[PDB]
Structure formats: C-alpha cells, structure tokens
Design a protein around this ligand. Structure first.
Ligand SMILES: [Mg+2]
Ligand SMILES: [Mg+2]
Ligand SMILES: [Mg+2]
Ligand SMILES: [Mg+2]
Ligand SMILES: [Mg+2]
Ligand SMILES: [Mg+2]
Ligand SMILES: [Mg+2]
Ligand SMILES: [Mg+2]
Ligand SMILES: [Mg+2]
Ligand SMILES: [Mg+2]
Ligand SMILES: [Mg+2]
Ligand SMILES: [Mg+2]
Ligand SMILES: [Mg+2]
Ligand SMILES: [Mg+2]
Ligand SMILES: [Mg+2]
Ligand SMILES: [Mg+2]
Ligand SMILES: [Mg+2]
Ligand SMILES: [Mg+2]
Ligand SMILES: [Mg+2]
Ligand SMILES: [Mg+2]
Ligand SMILES: [Mg+2]
Ligand SMILES: [Mg+2]
Ligand SMILES: [Mg+2]
Ligand SMILES: [Mg+2]
Ligand SMILES: [Mg+2]
Ligand SMILES: [Mg+2]
Ligand SMILES: [Mg+2]
Ligand SMILES: [Mg+2]
Ligand SMILES: [Mg+2]
Ligand SMILES: [Mg+2]
Ligand SMILES: [Mg+2]
Ligand SMILES: [Mg+2]
Ligand SMILES: [Mg+2]
Ligand SMILES: [Mg+2]
Ligand SMILES: [Mg+2]
Ligand SMILES: [Mg+2]
Ligand SMILES: [Mg+2]
Ligand SMILES: [Mg+2]
Ligand SMILES: [Mg+2]
Ligand SMILES: [Mg+2]
Ligand SMILES: [Mg+2]
Ligand SMILES: [Mg+2]
Ligand SMILES: [Mg+2]
Ligand SMILES: [Mg+2]
Ligand SMILES: [Mg+2]
Ligand SMILES: [Mg+2]
Ligand SMILES: [Mg+2]
Ligand SMILES: [Mg+2]
Ligand SMILES: [Mg+2]
Ligand SMILES: [Mg+2]
Ligand SMILES: [Mg+2]
Ligand SMILES: [Mg+2]
Ligand SMILES: [Mg+2]
Ligand SMILES: [Mg+2]
Ligand SMILES: [Mg+2]
Ligand SMILES: [Mg+2]
Ligand SMILES: [Mg+2]
Ligand SMILES: [Mg+2]
Ligand SMILES: [Mg+2]
Ligand SMILES: [Mg+2]
Ligand SMILES: [Mg+2]
Ligand SMILES: [Mg+2]
Ligand SMILES: [Mg+2]
Ligand SMILES: [Mg+2]
Ligand SMILES: [Mg+2]
Ligand SMILES: [Mg+2]
Ligand SMILES: [Mg+2]
Lengths: 144, 62, 124, 207
RNA sequence: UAGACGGUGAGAGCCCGGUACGCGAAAACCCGGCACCUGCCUAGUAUCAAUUCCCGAGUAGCAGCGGGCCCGUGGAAUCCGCUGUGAAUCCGCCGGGACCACCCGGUAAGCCUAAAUACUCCUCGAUGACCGAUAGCGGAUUAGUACCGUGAGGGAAUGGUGAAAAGUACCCCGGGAGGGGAGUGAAAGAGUACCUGAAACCGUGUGCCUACAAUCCGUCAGAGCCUCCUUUUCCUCUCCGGAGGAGGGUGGUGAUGGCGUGCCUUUUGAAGAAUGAGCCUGCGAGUCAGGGACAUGUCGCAAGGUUAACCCGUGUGGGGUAGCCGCAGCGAAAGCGAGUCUGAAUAGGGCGACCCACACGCGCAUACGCGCGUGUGAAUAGUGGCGUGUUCUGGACCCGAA
RNA sequence: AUGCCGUGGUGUAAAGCGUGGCAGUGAGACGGCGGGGGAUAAGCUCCGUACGUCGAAAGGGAAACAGCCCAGAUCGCCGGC
RNA sequence: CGCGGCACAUCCACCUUGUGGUGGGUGUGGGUAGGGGAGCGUCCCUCAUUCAGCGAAGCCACCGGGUGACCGGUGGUGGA
C-alpha cells in the first residue's frame, strides 16, 4: 500500500533556498555585494554604459519597414505528405490539421523538401515550383 | 506587471534562424566623399554581434 | 507563522557562560564579553599546544645540560657521542634518568665519551 | 482484477470487472508527491496580513532635529526598528493555487487506485443501507464485516442521500462523489468502498 | 439524519448550552397571486403614379488656437472646447487615417432603458499551515482617554490569585506598614505587591588566593590548601562503623615561570591617539505579486505540448480550442522556398538547411567513397508544471537629510 | 646578455582554449633592480619588471616591527632532524 | 620526518558496476571580497507512530556525547 508517509519527491528536484545575510559561516554581512557604490544599495540599469553613447545608440537602425498586409502561409513539406500518408488519397487543408503537420484556421502551402513516391492528391493554396514536379511525377495532381 | 522589451534595441538587432543576433554597421550614413569604395563596402551587410556584448543585447530584446 | 526568537537564542548563550566560569569582571557575567574572551582563550590554546612541544624540550635540554656537567662533559658533546654509539634515547627519557637515577646517566656519559672522535677539533 | 459486489446483510450477487488502463497503471511515487502537494496548497486560505511602515497609523512627521541633540536621527516614529512600527517583509495576502496539468493529475489518481486494487482493497457494495431512512448502527456493522482498518473512503452517488447520511459521523470515513475522486483522499484511505452504481459511473467516464 | 464548537474542578457523541433533523409568528415590513381600480386599441389594408412637401440649425462643413487618442503638429483622418464665417432634406448629408474619383456601410445635430460589473461604515452566519500583550487596530486595561499644542493636529503606557475567596478567625512585636505562630487549600515553593519567575544589578554565609607589587585580565606549565567518592598495609571496636595515615582520582581555588596590542566598521595599513557600542532582556534587515525575462535541476506528455476567461460541482475534481510557443528559412519589402537576398553572372559571399561503421550496389576505382538505393532502423525535440540562481517593473535588503 | 614569435624532442595530473550561470574588483602599499619630474632631496611623485612579500599569511629571526630574511598552519603527540 | 584521526581529488581491482558503497596506491586541504557543495536549531501544518496530572512545556543545576552549528541522560523547579 502507498500511504502519505511513503511519498517523497524525486532525488534532486527540491533543493534548499539560499537565505542570505545570516552569518559569517554563509554569505555574510554584505550578502554578496562587497562594494560601497551603486551596486551596494541600488540597481544599475541594463541600458546604461557608464556615460558613453550606448550599444543601442551607436549602431544604426535596421533598414526598412514591416509589411502591414503580409499574408503569410503555413508550411508542409512534400516529404511529410509521404510519411503521414503512405498509401495516397485526397490531401485537403482539413486532413493536414488532424494529422498534426499544420495549424488550425490558417492557409497551407506545400513545399518540396524530400522524396515522394505515393500517389498523393493534395489541395492547397499556392504550391511551390518544385512541388508540382514531385507530385505530377507520381500521378498526383495539384488543385486550388 | 508584464515585462517590457527595450523599444530602441528592437530596431537595431534582429535574429537569424539559429539564435544569432545580427546588427548593422556605422560610418556609412553621411560624409561619404573622402571614403573610398573599399571602406563603404566593408561597412555593408550585417555582422554577428560580438562575443563580449551578447549578454547585454539578449537582455534588451528579451 | 511568527517565531519568538528566544528558545533558539539562549543555547549559544549558556554554553559560553559555562566555559567562561573562573574569569574576573564582565568576562564571566555578560555574554558579549565572554564571547570576546573565548575567541582569545581558544586561540591561546592552539598557540600553546604547539608551543609546549618546544617548551618541555627546552627544559629537558637544561636538565641534561646540568647533569652532564656533573660528569664534566658538555651538552654539545654528549649528543654527538650518543648518536655515534647509536643510542636513540629521546630527551624526555634521557632527562628522567638524570633526575631519578644518577648511576645510570653516568653510564650513558662514559659511552658517549668513549665513542666520541679522538680529536674533536680535527677536520673529519 | 475481479471485485465481487457485496450486499447489506447478505451475499455476493454479481461481479464488476476493473479495467486495466484504469486500475493497473504502475505506481509512480515522484508524481503523486507533486499532485498531493499541489492540492494542499489549494487548501491554504492564504489570509494573513501585517502592516508596513506606510500603513501603520500616524508617523507622518520627523520627530526632532537631526543635528544638535546627540541622539540618533530617526526620520519617522513608525520606521521598522521602533517598538510599534511597521513590519518589514511581513506576510501579505497570498494565493497558492498551483497549475498542475490535467494528465499529471489523472495519471496520479489512476496510480493511486491501482495501488489499492493490487493489494485487494477496492470493494464494491450495492447500497449501504437497505431502506430509505438512514441508520448508522447497521452501516457501521456492514463496514466492519468488510474491513477492520481505521480509514475508509466511501464513494457513493450524488442522489443517494439515504446512505450518504448514514456515514457522515463515523470516525475515519470520508464521503465523495464519483467525479470528485482526487489523489489526496485515496492515499489517506486504506480501503476504497465503491457502489455498483458509482463504479460504473467512474469507469464509463474514462472508456 | 447528532464524533461541529465551547463550558463543566484535566483530553467528554452518552453531565450542561447545544449540533443533526424537524416545528414556530399576534403585529410590523418585504415579496407573490387574484379581485377592485387605472389606462390602451376597435378602422384600415393592398396595389399604383412619382409632380410637390417634410425627415431635428447659429448644429454640421471650412478656417484660427488648444485638449485627447499608439500618434509629442507631423502628410494628420475620426473625436471634444472657445472665436470668426456659416449650407443643404434624398440627385440629401456623414464615415471607411491627408486628398480626389468610383464603390460598399450608415442616417448625426431630441429622449428614455433591466442584466453582466465596482464597493462594505454597518447586520447576521461561517473560515485561517494569521497574531497571543514590545505581537495583533493607535486602542484586550478611564482609548482617540490621560498627556502635549494657542490652534490645525499629534497621541501613550497599564491583562493572568485559586477549581472555589474558602482573601490568613484568633494570639504575639509594632503608632502603623510589615512580620511570626496558628489556620484555609492539592499547593501560600498561589497571600489582592499574587501562575511559571530567566538575565542585568544588589546583599548575606562560606572553601581558596590577595597588603615588595607594573596584571587586553587570558592560556600552557605549576606547587600548596580545602572538599567529595575509592584500592591497598594497618587500628581490627568488623555484622560493626569504613578509625587514621600513604597512593590514585573528580570539583573549587592558583603562590609561581613562558607567550600574549579587546571586539566591530572602514582602510595602502588600526590595539589605537580613526568610527560605533554603559550593561542585560525582548524587538530590528534580499521578502512578495506576474502562465513575466534568461539560464539550470526534476517530473509529465512527446511531433506535439498547454489551456485563459468562463461553466457544472457540499473542495483540491471534471469540462472549456479562443490563444500562446514549437512545426523552415531568406529578404527593406513584392516575394520565392531547402533554399533566398546582393548581382548583368550555374562568379564570390552573407545568413539557413543537408546522418554512415557497413555489406550489397557503384561509367566500378591500384587503392580510398564520392553519385544512389529497400533496412543494416547513425540520433535529433520541443512544450507544460513545481524547485533554485540572477533579473525587469513596482517602496524592492534596512535605516538617514537639508 | 636577457626577453618575445614558431617548430622537433624529453618532463609534468589538478595547465590551457571554446561556450553558458554567478561574480566580485577597477583608491593599492612598501622592498630589490631599470629610468622620468624634483635640488639625481624625501616614509616625494609617475612608469617598467612570468620580480618578491603584504593586501588576503599565522609560525621562527631582525630588542619591539603590515611590506625586509627563513618558511606556507588539516587535527592530535610530555617524540627526532 | 615518525605514529594515530578526519576530509577532498584522482588512480588501480571488485558488485545493481556512478542512484553508488567496499579495498589499497599516490597527491592535496592558510585565506578577505567572492562562487560552489553539504548540514544544525526554533515555530507552524499533514500522514504515521509514541509519551503525558504515576507530572508535558519552559526554566536551573550536574554527569556525559558529536568533525561544526549543537545533542542526550539523571535530578530539582513547575503545572498542560
Ligand atoms: Mg558582523
Ligand atoms: Mg562593486
Ligand atoms: Mg572603495
Ligand atoms: Mg559598509
Ligand atoms: Mg558625455
Ligand atoms: Mg542613407
Ligand atoms: Mg563612393
Ligand atoms: Mg581563575
Ligand atoms: Mg617542533
Ligand atoms: Mg504615513
Ligand atoms: Mg520623511
Ligand atoms: Mg502595530
Ligand atoms: Mg482545471
Ligand atoms: Mg469537543
Ligand atoms: Mg441537549
Ligand atoms: Mg436625422
Ligand atoms: Mg475645427
Ligand atoms: Mg494633442
Ligand atoms: Mg480610405
Ligand atoms: Mg435619432
Ligand atoms: Mg441615458
Ligand atoms: Mg446597470
Ligand atoms: Mg458582498
Ligand atoms: Mg462578522
Ligand atoms: Mg499594544
Ligand atoms: Mg508574556
Ligand atoms: Mg489644552
Ligand atoms: Mg498574618
Ligand atoms: Mg505562615
Ligand atoms: Mg491542612
Ligand atoms: Mg496532584
Ligand atoms: Mg504547584
Ligand atoms: Mg513584582
Ligand atoms: Mg511568582
Ligand atoms: Mg606578598
Ligand atoms: Mg616591564
Ligand atoms: Mg601568569
Ligand atoms: Mg587613511
Ligand atoms: Mg580592502
Ligand atoms: Mg584607548
Ligand atoms: Mg577606540
Ligand atoms: Mg563612543
Ligand atoms: Mg545596542
Ligand atoms: Mg539581545
Ligand atoms: Mg524575418
Ligand atoms: Mg550560396
Ligand atoms: Mg517560493
Ligand atoms: Mg575609476
Ligand atoms: Mg586607478
Ligand atoms: Mg602601480
Ligand atoms: Mg616597485
Ligand atoms: Mg629608483
Ligand atoms: Mg610612496
Ligand atoms: Mg601615494
Ligand atoms: Mg608575517
Ligand atoms: Mg600568495
Ligand atoms: Mg613575526
Ligand atoms: Mg621575540
Ligand atoms: Mg640537531
Ligand atoms: Mg579552505
Ligand atoms: Mg597547508
Ligand atoms: Mg566568503
Ligand atoms: Mg515532582
Ligand atoms: Mg510550543
Ligand atoms: Mg543541553
Ligand atoms: Mg527532564
Ligand atoms: Mg522538566
């Protein structure tokens, strides 16, 4: 039988807490600070480099904007159309979600990394150039 | 109390595909007459942020 | 949970003021001065349990040097004579023979005298 | 694996089979210690307060001149080194509700019921009391013919108010719904006593 | 159907108030139904013409100066204020981030509106890995009282006899206060100064040392005296009782020799003639909140992991796919995609992908695996809990100004 | 003369280099040697030095002694060199 | 240097063969700021077990114990 005086945590998952400022036998009077300066009573900010013009005002801005209308696409390679579907059949946008290779409520796009032998028949948005030649080379077809 | 990222260093540092931090190079905005073309060309592109200043740039983007 | 600090704290106070009996002044009645004395009283024993190896030796040398000169040889020439004849008796026991039995320390002199080189000032 | 249903003042009428993916999971010690701890933390009411130096009443002025007297400068009469000042890093009201995943909770309950069923402790009874009015002298005797141990968890249905009233005031008997089995309560008990209407509700909630 | 909690001369379901579970309201107020009462409707509807009328005025638009929105006057739209100018009623007017044109959406300048939500001076009923008298409200005690201030305001300290007062009848010393003997009680080692009664500090009795000595007060050597428990060999009163000395040992003291510059902070360096402490007792300083940020330990599931609000539960239990992070990168971006950007370039770079130790296979090569194979099944791996170190925002380790 | 850069031997456990966590430190002091400013004064100042000690190092020696000489304390010992 | 006690690091043989113990080699252990590793004592809760008006806590003395914080036994006081 397992009772509550037989349960114990895994060896190493509960290590003791470092209580600091409690004697010369441990981290003593200064509690790991030592100094007599800003570090001994306050915090120094990260953005501050002692006065000179910092690392984020010497280097210039990264060039250019971000597109407000960049319609992205999700990605499934043609090498995982093979392994997930080893006997062919229709490959819609819906069945790729349930097999776990693409996200819900997004747009799919089949790329061409890998080898394809099974006669798949995939429907998607906006196929690659190298995916219409690894699918039609196995009797498949690529619709919209 | 949700942690803010630094609003200026996110315009001067971006990330590549393997966790590197890249940036641009200076001395290329103005006064470009007396700079020959073997100097304006060295300052083109993007370099990896140096190995001694990668802790203060991680803790500004994050 | 709030803890009154008192049952824990009175434990390093009783065992200083038991090891501080016999002292005179504030150094046996108060905790803050008996702790300052125990820091000095235990260092003066670590300093002196190592010094007293060299302080009983310093007395055995003087007791041999006294009883050597009742048999007209110096301590400079008794230890040479005992190392030459191969008598590895340490100086604690070589002193306690000289006190407690004078007719046995004499026979350790007449061995160290006879086993000494003939010209002690000659280069060898 | 095969637990026979008993009857109040009677005999064995049937048998109810305990499925293996619900009563023969291996007993993982280092997981049930985290589900038990994350449950007593949710029982902490977390109502404890003290006052800082900014909420202890008064203390607004500076009491005397900083240079001139020979006393130490003090700044406020309610700073935390005064007798009667605020408490520094005192307790505030806190919540302790840990956020354990669902699979770590379900697979620690199923490891708790399995460890009782492996040693022959899961019992099944058809009802505690054979009437509709409650009674304790019968249900104490009926749980004494099952077990002779100090801790019993009696899982009966929610709408069985005739027998739920019959085991409220027994010393060392806990009462919970079939959909309220948790890890801290099985592990306190020695002997889990289901109902044949209650065990079929727990098995058919997990296929 | 009562083992909640408290009281009773100590840990009580069966002694008591009660709890579980039932019963109860003259009158008052709250709510609900039916009546009375009060109001409303009982003339329009459908097709059709498209001429005319109307559809909220010093309002909208535009302009000047401001306010506020992610938006600090900027290319500045929607929205509001003041000052000028000041239309139109469906072919009307306004918005869709200057602006025009086309399209889609909508009818400003009149009004009213439950629910979801914020709060607790107060009322009753529950609860605490909250406090137990320097804590907890300032306030368990004349408590916003005494006291301080002209005033606004500031603002304390003080709880415990015993189960029951049974609170020491009576006698003695004393003016009394206080004691002693008696007594009450289990206890006066509980006497209205009162449970337990520590420490500083203050007496008294006693063993040892101390009036020729220069002492961070100790420590190592070390004699002598006193005290208490014991083997030996004796006195043998011996069942005695351990009578006395010698030897050994615990405890106290320490004549006397050697070494020895208190603690703390700050410093190049302190015994210090640098700073702090009269002594004791209590109190007084890296703590919390967040699915935060980075690492690391550990448990779960694993190409997936996980839920938030919320819902149903007498709880810690069960549901909940919105979402977040992983799943493919390059680019300023259109984009293209195991590749992409620069470029006139299948030139070179930048970032990113890409497995062998084989056999077989191999235009086979002296040899050596490059190109390519079914497995011989090279090892990738993330996400979510709880711990620890550091950190970000908040008072953020604590005290301190003018 | 030394010192430094590279390579081939021999020797050496607690050397190095790369990448993360966490730091402290950035007021030094005197002594030996080499030089500047000063008056070849200074317990003066500012430098160099795979130079030392102190700092952060007790013990023995220089009468006493942060910095000089000898030597680096794990604890015991009424033991030797 | 000689004889005993303790600790760390590596090496050599052995067993679940690092979740580690056993056995002998050799080296090593002054330390401020500081980093890492492992523990003692007080108080609260839960599970199990045990002692308590035949005297708990707390407080005082004495005889002992552990490498350190500190711990135990007996007596006295006292009253949950
Ligand atoms: Mg200190
Ligand atoms: Mg510093
Ligand atoms: Mg400084
Ligand atoms: Mg300081
Ligand atoms: Mg400047
Ligand atoms: Mg430019
Ligand atoms: Mg040019
Ligand atoms: Mg003395
Ligand atoms: Mg010596
Ligand atoms: Mg205030
Ligand atoms: Mg102030
Ligand atoms: Mg207070
Ligand atoms: Mg849940
Ligand atoms: Mg009770
Ligand atoms: Mg009753
Ligand atoms: Mg209108
Ligand atoms: Mg306007
Ligand atoms: Mg504005
Ligand atoms: Mg527009
Ligand atoms: Mg309207
Ligand atoms: Mg309104
Ligand atoms: Mg409302
Ligand atoms: Mg309310
Ligand atoms: Mg209330
Ligand atoms: Mg108070
Ligand atoms: Mg008290
Ligand atoms: Mg007045
Ligand atoms: Mg009297
Ligand atoms: Mg009396
Ligand atoms: Mg009596
Ligand atoms: Mg009694
Ligand atoms: Mg008593
Ligand atoms: Mg008193
Ligand atoms: Mg008293
Ligand atoms: Mg004298
Ligand atoms: Mg003198
Ligand atoms: Mg002396
Ligand atoms: Mg100075
Ligand atoms: Mg210093
Ligand atoms: Mg002085
Ligand atoms: Mg001083
Ligand atoms: Mg002073
Ligand atoms: Mg003080
Ligand atoms: Mg104190
Ligand atoms: Mg990008
Ligand atoms: Mg390329
Ligand atoms: Mg915590
Ligand atoms: Mg500086
Ligand atoms: Mg400097
Ligand atoms: Mg220098
Ligand atoms: Mg020099
Ligand atoms: Mg010189
Ligand atoms: Mg100088
Ligand atoms: Mg100087
Ligand atoms: Mg020295
Ligand atoms: Mg050194
Ligand atoms: Mg010296
Ligand atoms: Mg000397
Ligand atoms: Mg010699
Ligand atoms: Mg050390
Ligand atoms: Mg050493
Ligand atoms: Mg340290
Ligand atoms: Mg007693
Ligand atoms: Mg207690
Ligand atoms: Mg003790
Ligand atoms: Mg006792
Ligand atoms: Mg006691």
């Amino acid at each position: 039988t397992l009772k509550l005086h037989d349960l114990r945590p895994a060896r190493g998952s509960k290590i003791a807490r470092t209580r600091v400022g409690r004697g010369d036998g441990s981290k003593g009077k200064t509690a790991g600070r030592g100094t007599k300066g800003t570090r001994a009573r306050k915090q120094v900010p990260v953005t501050f480099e002692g006065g000179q013009m910092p690392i984020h005002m010497r280097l210039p801005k990264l060039k250019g904007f971000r597109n407000r209308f960049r319609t992205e696409y999700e990605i499934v390679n043609v090498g995982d159309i093979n392994r997930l579907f080893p006997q062919g059949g229709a490959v819609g946008v819906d069945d790729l979600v349930a097999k776990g290779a693409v996200r819900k409520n997004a747009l799919v796009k089949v790329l061409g990394d890998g080898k394809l032998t099974a006669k798949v028949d995939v429907s998607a948005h906006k196929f690659s150039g190298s995916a219409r030649a690894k699918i039609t080379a196995a009797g498949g077809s690529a619709t919209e | 109390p949700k942690a803010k990222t630094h609003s200026g260093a996110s315009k001067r540092f971006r990330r590549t595909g393997t966790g590197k931090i890249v940036r641009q190079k200076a001395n290329r905005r103005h006064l470009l007459e007396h700079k020959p073309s073997t100097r304006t060309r060295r300052l083109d592109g993007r370099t990896v942020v140096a190995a001694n200043d990668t802790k203060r740039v991680t803790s500004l983007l994050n | 949970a709030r803890v009154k600090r008192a049952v824990n704290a009175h434990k390093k106070r009783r065992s200083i003021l038991k090891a501080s009996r016999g002292y005179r002044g504030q150094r046996s009645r108060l905790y803050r001065k008996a702790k300052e004395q125990q820091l000095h009283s235990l260092n003066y024993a670590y300093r002196d349990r190592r010094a007293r190896k060299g302080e009983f030796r310093k007395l055995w040398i003087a007791r041999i040097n006294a009883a050597a000169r009742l048999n007209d040889i110096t301590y400079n020439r008794l230890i040479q004579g005992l190392k030459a004849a191969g008598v590895e008796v340490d100086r604690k026991n070589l002193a306690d023979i000289a006190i407690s039995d004078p007719a046995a320390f004499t026979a350790l002199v007449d061995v160290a005298r006879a086993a000494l080189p003939e010209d002690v000032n000659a280069p060898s | 694996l095969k637990i026979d249903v008993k009857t109040p003042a009677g005999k064995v009428d049937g048998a109810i089979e305990l499925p293996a993916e619900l009563f023969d999971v291996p007993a993982n010690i280092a997981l049930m210690h985290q589900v038990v701890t994350a449950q007593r933390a949710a029982a902490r009411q977390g109502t404890h307060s003290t006052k800082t130096r900014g909420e202890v009443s008064g203390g607004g002025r500076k009491p005397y001149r900083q240079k001139g007297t020979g006393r130490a400068r003090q700044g406020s009469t309610r700073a935390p080194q005064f007798t009667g000042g605020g408490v520094v890093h005192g307790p505030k009201p806190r919540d302790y509700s840990q956020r354990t995943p669902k699979k770590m909770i379900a697979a620690a309950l199923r490891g708790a019921l399995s460890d009782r069923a492996r040693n022959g402790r899961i019992h099944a009874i058809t009802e505690l009391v054979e009437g509709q009015n409650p009674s304790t002298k019968s249900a104490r005797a009926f749980l004494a013919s099952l077990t002779e141990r100090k801790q019993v968890l009696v899982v009966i249905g929610r709408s069985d108010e005739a027998g739920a009233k019959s085991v409220r005031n027994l010393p060392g008997v806990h009462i919970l719904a079939p959909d309220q089995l948790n890890t801290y309560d099985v592990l306190r008990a020695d002997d889990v006593v289901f109902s044949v209407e209650a065990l079929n509700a727990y098995i058919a909630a997990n296929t």
